[PDB]
Amino acid sequence: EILEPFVDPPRDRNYRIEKDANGGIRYVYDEIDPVYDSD
Amino acid sequence: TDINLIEIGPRFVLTPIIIQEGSFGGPILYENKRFISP
């Protein structure tokens, strides 16, 4: 199913999109729980 | 009975330089425009 006969056919996230204090882009990651590891 | 204080250990002074919003980056929230570096 190609529409235009001689062109090329058109063609796990760890952060959150949040507005920062200044007004740009701020990334919010998964918080760290302080549970002690088995090792 | 009352209590008195006897000093133990670390006697040290903290000149504020900067306070950021991010974990170790992000926008600057507080900047101390007095600091004279060594």
Torsion sign (Cα): B19, B21, B25, B29 = negative
Q: b/e per residue, A22-39, with b = 16+ CB within 10 A?
A: eeeebeeeeeeeeeeeee
DSSP B31: E
CA distance B28 to chain A (A): 9
The one-letter code for the residue type at A28 is V
Cβ contacts of B26 on chain A, cutoff 8 Å: 20, 26
d(CA B28, CA B11): 29
Q: Do A22 and B27 touch (CB under 8 A)?
A: yes
Residues in contact with B21: Cβ distance below 8 Å, sequence separation at least 6, in sequence order: A20, A21, A26, B27, B28, B29
Mutate to test the interface with B, among A26, A28, A32 (most CBs of B within 10 A): A26
d(CA A15, CA A29): 5
